Amino acid sequence: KNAKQIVHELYNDISISKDPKYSDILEVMQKVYLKLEKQKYELDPSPLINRLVNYLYFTAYTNKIRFTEYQEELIRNMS
Numbered sequence: 001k002n003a004k005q006i007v008h009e010l011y012n013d014i015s016i017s018k019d020p021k022y023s024d025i026l027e028v029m030q031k032v033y034l035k036l037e038k039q040k041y042e043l044d045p046s047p048l049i050n051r052l053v054n055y056l057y058f059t060a061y062t063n064k065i066r067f068t069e070y071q072e073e074l075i076r077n078m079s
Contacts, residue, residue: 003045
């Protein structure tokens with residue numbers, strides 16, 4: 001699984017939720033979606049994915065969000 005594939009898979013599963021607590025995460029991820037298509041991050045998406053992974057845990061803490069095991073697994077894949 002490459003960066004683009006995992007991000008898309010997580011985005012898709014989170015949007016299935018239909019819980020407003022995830023709206024801010026989805027917002028951030030759409031921007032990550034697009035940046036992954038760019039040249040720079042095409043070569044090395046690592047720094048971008050690391051920022052996303054760190055953002056996910058930080059915001060999850062701040063807003064008391066819980067991810068499912070299925071979602072946590074995908075995040076682990078990213079880290």
